[PDB]
């Protein structure tokens, strides 16, 4: 109530006179600022709106509730000299202009202005022009708290100050920081906005100390003795500077406190332990998740520098629209932005579903959405540039081959003539094949947008979920894109599309499994905007990332190590890659590095680490890692990093065993699957390289194209090879159902392997001795597949499969029970029999 | 007519470009530079329709667009990380002479920064790493030229040393950091300073390692 009266008084002070309508409007505006903002649920806000209107009608009857009341009630002194009402459109335009200005002479990252941002900006403005104005921005982490607070403070000309978070933070340091802030604000008449986050409010002593200054605008028992005398000398100086005759100590301290009240503002940032005294001492403003419209506008703005144009894009009837204000008819760009919003909503829905199911689930924040859009932009640029340079290479080859057709015609005008005619027909066949290649390239131009959207969505959002959940999310996204008439290839090999042969083979040279999950994890490790947080209980991923950056002097450190901060300082200063394990015990000092906060002072590009400004090196990269799968991290840490998970599950393991069965028993079908994967981009790249070599050999012509007419074989070779890949395009579907049928045949064996391995790993509940590694089960599996003598001398695939199924249980039981008590042999046999009974059909 | 007017406006914009060029590179401020470039863009856009349809108008139009685009490169080139070595690397890799003491903004404006951005960015990152290492060694010099042993009395007979742990952590940190700098890709021209400093730190570490043992033994024997 006191803050209500104070705000109304501040609004009514510089103004001359109003009707009752203006007083009612400002009263309602202050009521909304003090009560509606602290609300979370929107219908509660609607209830508050309706009841403010009801009370206004009741207490003040016979007053026009349309001239004095509107849905937008916005007050500011930005378009005037008094704190008067002002229309929303000019407010938005002015704030857009000031955002463009704030881009330049400050930290430069793209920002978007929507309705929520505008309201929050006006709220920070209001709290900054209220005496003893203190606000608590509560909401989801990584949504705009610090950015909006600093931006508004810069707009109002307040020197932004923040408390540096450093390992083993000392309370005396906090006291001296408060002393400096108070001296700069009260004495020097400097308007300072003070901002804190959960990374620093973790010590309740700081909060219980600052409650005194939040309530009274002063800290008793802080300025004593020599500090007291020095502050008094400077405060007398400031009082003379302003024009006061005040020279008594106690009244000078009182004037210092009043100046602190008028100038110093404190802003809090938190995520939904905290005393209610903090909640009540300052103003509360809810800062919930970005709305659907907000996400739509972010997608529309950040993709403006991208093509996403299809003039012949047919509008699909029954559009599964998620943004309730999509323009009719939806263009291609609007459709893509709608798809991105739907993707974010599907991540939220999947997290909710896993939360309901009891499984572990980790929060998704607008930072993930921004990362997704950034990855979309980078991948779109990459693929577009690559395909366009291939376009121009094919075109220049077409003119070169036409020039040589003319040259060989000139040579023919001079039995070798018949061979020259054969050369001519071969060249013409090459020419039409290249024209058809250009047509297929136009088709790829059509497909690239959807392909990029799906790949970027897979990279950015997915990465913490297992193989099955990743597949479900990708299926949902692809089904939505198909439902929105978006051109993407009906079959997508993310592993192939996001890499090629050479990175995969060098990863295989590294200590990296050939598992599809592992390949996707490596791809995520390659392309990343936020530093990865590798999750793996085994440790193959850490050794792999070591072997990858071995030449770059990669270093290992753990949060438990006391020298971790020192190694971090060295790596950051020098730019060597750093690997950090045990992120479960996390140190918030890493937050500025993950957030990529840098300042450019002169020739130096520094970063605030702890309490020291470390010079950032332009080659530094960090890899967070952990070994415990069951662990929860705060949503801030989730926002800061991208998650890469190596934990084996039943789906991943069954896919592994299915691949091994296909390799060992049906090498022809696994080879066919490999050819199907290579058909995506590997065969085309090899064919284009052979085309490059043919063009190069063709370039050295001095009449030697017809000397003995022997180079044309290479041409035929190329053409032959071309025909080969063409045939694999024809029977791609046939290979698909063939491999699908054989995988359906072999699937129950893989399910049995997954179930038996999980039974083995759960065996530890019985006795502490019963510990078995994944490598043990794979050893048993390889013994069953390769060095099993029962399979010798038989070729019927069904018979070999049945023999393998029997021997799997037999050998697994033998190997386990030899290292297992006699009392539990029957228990393990019963479990194995239950598994096989579930597996068998009939 | 219209052609005389557009030629006069072209002369005006040529004079403005010449005035911007003649300002030496050591005095041009990129903030004032972008202010003037924006002023020139508004000067071009404010022209009537007839003067907006000429080919020379288009020429100065995308010319100023390219200038505003390369303005960013102008900001990074204006830094303290390229004192003399990196500029000379730029000249030898760009094959155009640009002596800093005679350099003017016009000379940099002459060369195509659309095309030579790769060398610029590479030498920029190299210079950033170099100045990071240089600032670390400066911090080493400042901290070691002022550090002193905290001495406390003992039985009112002599002033012994208190604070062995902090000095040990300081020296070990400095040794580890210089050894890690030895692995940095920018550790080429700082080698002699690094060797001298690691020699000094090894001497300090060994000296104090034996000093603390001597101190403990002596106080034990005195007791
Ligand atoms: N309105 C906005 N538009 C675009 N990006 C934003 C906006 N608000 C915040 N961001 C992004 O958030 C990042 C900073 O995180 P921040 O939102 O400050 O986290 P916190 O929620 O802890 O304040 C910046 O990189 C910025 O790009």
Q: What are phi and psi of B66, to 5 degrees?
A: -65, -35
Closest CA to A275 of A194, A210, A213: A210
Using the CB atoms, write b or e for A663-695: b if 16+ within 10 Å. Answer: ebbbeebbebbebbebbbebbbeebeeebeebe
Whether the Cβ atoms of residue B179 and residue B123 lie closer than 8 Å to each other: no
The rounded distance, in Å, linking the Cα atoms of A113 and A379 is: 25
**Would you give the DSSP letter of residue A515?**
-
The rounded distance, in Å, linking the Cα atoms of A333 and A310 is: 9
Asked if B128 lies within 8 A of A603 by C-beta distance, the reply is yes
Decide: A143 in ligand 1 pocket, CB within 6 A: yes
Structure tokens at A508: 């295989």
What is the distance in angstroms between the Cα of B181 and the nearest Cα belonging to chain A?
6
Closest CA to A503 of A528, A487, A522: A522
Cβ pairs A/B, distance under 8 A: 71
The rounded distance, in Å, linking the Cα atoms of B46 and B40 is: 10
The rounded distance, in Å, linking the Cα atoms of A469 and A463 is: 10
Whether the Cβ atoms of residue A160 and residue A185 lie closer than 8 Å to each other: no
Q: How many CB atoms lie within 10 A of CB A436?
A: 11
Residue with tokens 């080698």: B191
Whether the Cβ atoms of residue A121 and residue A151 lie closer than 8 Å to each other: yes
What is the distance in angstroms between the Cα of A227 and the nearest Cα belonging to chain B?
25
Nearest by CB: A566 against B124, B132, B173: B173
Among left, alpha and beta (phi > 0; psi -120 to 50; other), residue A700 is beta
Residue with tokens 């959960």: A198
- Ligand 1: centre distance to CA A370 (Å): 9
Specify the 3-state DSSP secondary structure of B223: coil
* Strand duo A134-139 + A622-626: pairing: unpaired
Q: What is the CA radius of gyration of chain A?
A: 34
The rounded distance, in Å, linking the Cα atoms of A392 and A384 is: 12
Interchain CB contact of A9 with B (< 8 Å): no
User: What residues contact residue B96 under an 8 Å CB cut-off, 6+ apart?
Assistant: B111
Closest CA to A512 of A503, A773, A650: A503
Asked if B128 lies within 8 A of A569 by C-beta distance, the reply is no
Among left, alpha and beta (phi > 0; psi -120 to 50; other), residue A485 is left
Which residues does B contribute to its contact with A (CB < 8 Å)?
31, 34, 79-82, 124-125, 127-129, 131-133, 135-136, 173, 176-177, 180-181, 183-187
What is the distance in angstroms between the Cα of A688 and the nearest Cα belonging to chain B?
27
CA atoms within 13 A on the CB side of A480: 24
Q: What is the CA radius of gyration of chain B?
A: 30
The answer to whether A141 is a known ligand-binding residue is yes
The rounded distance, in Å, linking the Cα atoms of B44 and A679 is: 53
Closest residue in A to B182 (Cα–Cα): A574
DSSP H/E element including A349 = helix A332-357
DSSP H/E element including B199 = helix B191-222
The rounded distance, in Å, linking the Cα atoms of A552 and A197 is: 35
Supply the residue whose CA is at minimum distance from atom 9 of ligand 1. Answer: A144
Supply the residue whose CA is at minimum distance from atom 5 of ligand 1. Answer: A111
Supply the residue whose CA is at minimum distance from atom 19 of ligand 1. Answer: A142
The rounded distance, in Å, linking the Cα atoms of A533 and B73 is: 34
Whether the Cβ atoms of residue A654 and residue A753 lie closer than 8 Å to each other: yes
Specify the 3-state DSSP secondary structure of B151: strand
Q: Which residues on neighbouring strands pair with residue A286, listed in sequence order?
A: A138
Whether the Cβ atoms of residue A128 and residue A156 lie closer than 8 Å to each other: yes
* Cited resolution, angstroms: 3.6
Q: What are phi and psi of A569, to 5 degrees?
A: -60, -45
Whether the Cβ atoms of residue A283 and residue A133 lie closer than 8 Å to each other: yes
The rounded distance, in Å, linking the Cα atoms of A223 and A250 is: 12
Query: What was the elucidation method?
Result: cryo-EM
The rounded distance, in Å, linking the Cα atoms of A215 and A282 is: 8
**Would you give the DSSP letter of residue A179?**
H
Among left, alpha and beta (phi > 0; psi -120 to 50; other), residue A194 is beta
The rounded distance, in Å, linking the Cα atoms of A341 and A321 is: 9
Closest CA to B144 of B165, B188, B175: B175
Among left, alpha and beta (phi > 0; psi -120 to 50; other), residue A283 is beta
Q: Which atom of ligand 1 is nearest to the CA of A117?
A: 1
Residue with tokens 């939220």: A348
Identify residues after which chain A is interrupted (C–N over 2.5 A): 272, 414
User: What residues contact residue A377 under an 8 Å CB cut-off, 6+ apart?
Assistant: A302, A303, A305, A306
């Amino acid at each position: 109530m006191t803050r209500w009266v104070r705000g109304i008084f501040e609004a009514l002070r510089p103004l001359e006179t109003l009707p009752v309508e203006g007083l009612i409007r400002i009263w309602a505006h202050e009521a909304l600022r003090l009560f509606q903002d602290r609300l979370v649920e929107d219908e509660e806000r609607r209830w508050t709106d309706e009841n403010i209107d009801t009370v206004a009608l009741k207490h003040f009857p016979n007053i026009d509730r349309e001239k004095a009341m509107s849905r937008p009630i916005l007050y500011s002194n930005w378009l005037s000299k008094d704190y008067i009402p002002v229309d929303q459109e000019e407010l938005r335009d002015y704030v857009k202009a000031r955002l463009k200005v704030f881009y330049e002479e400050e930290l430069d990252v793209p920002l978007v202005l929507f309705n929520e941002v505008l309201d929050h900006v006006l709220r920070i403005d209001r709290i900054f022009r209220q005496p003893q104005g203190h606000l608590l921005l509560i909401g989801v982490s990584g949504a705009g708290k610090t950015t909006l607070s600093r931006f508004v403070a810069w707009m109002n000309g307040l020197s932004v100050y923040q408390i540096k978070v450093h390992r083993k933070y000392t309370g005396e340091d906090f006291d001296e920081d408060l002393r400096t802030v108070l001296r700069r604000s009260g004495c020097k008449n400097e308007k300072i906005a003070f901002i804190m986050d959960e990374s620093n409010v973790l010590d309740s002593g700081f909060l219980e100390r600052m409650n005194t200054l939040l309530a009274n605008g002063e800290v008793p028992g802080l300025f004593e003795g020599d500090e007291y005398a020095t502050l008094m000398t400077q405060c007398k100086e400031g009082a003379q500077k302003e024009g006061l005759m005040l020279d008594s100590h106690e009244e000078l301290y009182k004037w210092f406190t009043s100046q602190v009240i008028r100038n110093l503002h404190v802003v809090f940032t938190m995520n939904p332990a905290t005393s209610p005294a903090l909640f009540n001492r300052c103003v509360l403003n809810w800062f919930g998740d970005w709305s659907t419209e907000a996400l739509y506008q972010v997608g529309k703005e950040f993709t403006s520098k991208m093509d996403l144009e299809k003039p012949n894009y047919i509008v699909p009837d029954y559009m599964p629209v998620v943004y309730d204000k999509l323009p009719q008819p939806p263009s291609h760009r609007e459709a893509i932005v709608n798809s991105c919003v739907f993707v974010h909503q599907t991540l939220h829905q999947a997290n909710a579903r896993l939360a309901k199911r009891g499984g572990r689930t980790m929060a998704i924040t607008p930072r993930h959405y921004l990362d997704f859009i950034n990855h979309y932009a980078n991948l779109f640029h990459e693929k577009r540039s690559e395909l366009e340079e291939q376009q121009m290479h094919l075109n220049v080859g077409l003119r070169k081959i036409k020039e040589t057709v003319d040259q060989v015609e000139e040579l023919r005008r001079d039995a070798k003539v018949n061979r020259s005619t054969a050369l001519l027909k071969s060249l013409s066949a090459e020419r039409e094949r290249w024209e058809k290649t250009s047509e297929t390239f136009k088709n790829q131009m059509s497909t690239i947008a959807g392909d990029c959207l799906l790949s970027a969505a897979f990279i950015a959002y997915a990465g913490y979920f297992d193989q099955q959940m990743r597949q479900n999310l990708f299926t949902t996204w692809s089904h939505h894109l198909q439902q929105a008439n978006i051109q993407f290839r009906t079959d997508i090999a993310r592993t192939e599309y996001l890499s090629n042969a050479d990175e995969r083979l060098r990863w295989q040279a590294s200590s990296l499994p050939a598992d599809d999950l592992c390949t996707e994890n490596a791809i995520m490790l390659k392309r990343f905007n936020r530093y990865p947080l590798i999750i793996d209980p085994s440790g193959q991923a850490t050794e792999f990332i070591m072997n990858e950056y071995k030449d770059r002097k990669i270093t290992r450190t753990s949060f438990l190590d006391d020298a971790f901060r020192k190694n971090l300082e060295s790596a950051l200063r020098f730019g060597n890659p750093l690997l950090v394990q045990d992120v479960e015990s996390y140190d918030p000092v890493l937050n500025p590095v993950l957030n990529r906060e840098v300042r450019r002072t002169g020739g130096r590009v520094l970063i605030t680490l702890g309490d020291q400004d470390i010079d950032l090196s332009p080659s530094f990269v960090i890899f967070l890692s952990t070994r415990d799968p069951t662990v929860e991290f705060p949503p801030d840490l989730c926002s800061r990093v991208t998650f890469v998970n190596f934990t084996v599950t039943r789906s991943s393991l069954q896919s592994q065993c299915l691949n091994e069965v296909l390799k060992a028993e049906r090498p022809d079908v696994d080879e066919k699957r490999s050819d199907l994967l290579k058909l995506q981009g590997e065969f085309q790249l090899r064919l284009r390289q052979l085309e490059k070599s043919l063009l190069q050999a063709l370039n050295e012509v001095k009449g030697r194209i017809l000397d003995d007419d022997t180079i044309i074989t290479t041409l035929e070779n190329l053409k032959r090879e071309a025909a080969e890949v063409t045939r694999k395009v024809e029977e791609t579907d046939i290979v698909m159902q063939e491999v699908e049928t054989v995988s359906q045949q072999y699937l129950p064996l893989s399910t049995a392997c997954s179930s038996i391995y999980f039974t083995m790993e759960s065996l530890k509940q019985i006795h502490f001795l019963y510990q078995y590694s994944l490598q043990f089960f794979l050893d048993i599996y390889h013994n069953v597949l390769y060095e099993n003598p029962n399979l010798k001398g038989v070729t019927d695939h069904t018979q070999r499969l049945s023999i393998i199924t029997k021997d799997l249980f037999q050998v697994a039981f033998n190997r386990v029970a030899r290292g297992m008590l006699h009392q539990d042999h029957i228990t393990f046999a019963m479990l194995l029999a239950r598994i096989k009974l579930k597996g068998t059909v009939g | 007519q219209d052609l005389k007017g557009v030629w006069s406006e072209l002369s005006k914009v040529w004079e403005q470009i010449d005035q911007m060029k003649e300002q030496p590179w050591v005095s041009v401020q990129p903030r004032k530079l972008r202010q003037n470039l924006d002023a020139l863009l508004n000067q071009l856009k404010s022209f009537p329709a007839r003067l907006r349809q000429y080919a020379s108008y288009e020429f100065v139009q995308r010319l100023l667009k390219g200038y505003m685009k390369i303005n960013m490169l102008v900001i990074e080139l204006k830094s303290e990380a390229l004192k003399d070595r990196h500029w000379k690397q730029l000249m030898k890799r760009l094959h155009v002479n640009w002596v800093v003491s005679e350099l003017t903004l016009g000379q940099i404006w002459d060369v195509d920064l659309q095309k030579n951005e790769a060398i610029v960015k590479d030498v920029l990152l190299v210079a950033q790493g170099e100045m990071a290492l240089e600032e670390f060694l400066k911090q080493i010099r400042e901290v070691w030229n002022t550090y002193e042993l905290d001495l406390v009395n003992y039985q009112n007979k002599c002033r012994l040393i208190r604070g062995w742990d902090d000095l040990f952590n300081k020296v070990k940190e400095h040794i580890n950091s210089v050894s890690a700098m030895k692995l940095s890709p920018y550790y080429k021209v700082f080698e002699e300073d690094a060797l001298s400093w690691e020699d000094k730190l090894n001497r300090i570490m060994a000296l104090f390692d034996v000093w603390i043992d001597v101190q403990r033994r002596w106080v034990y024997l005195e007791g």
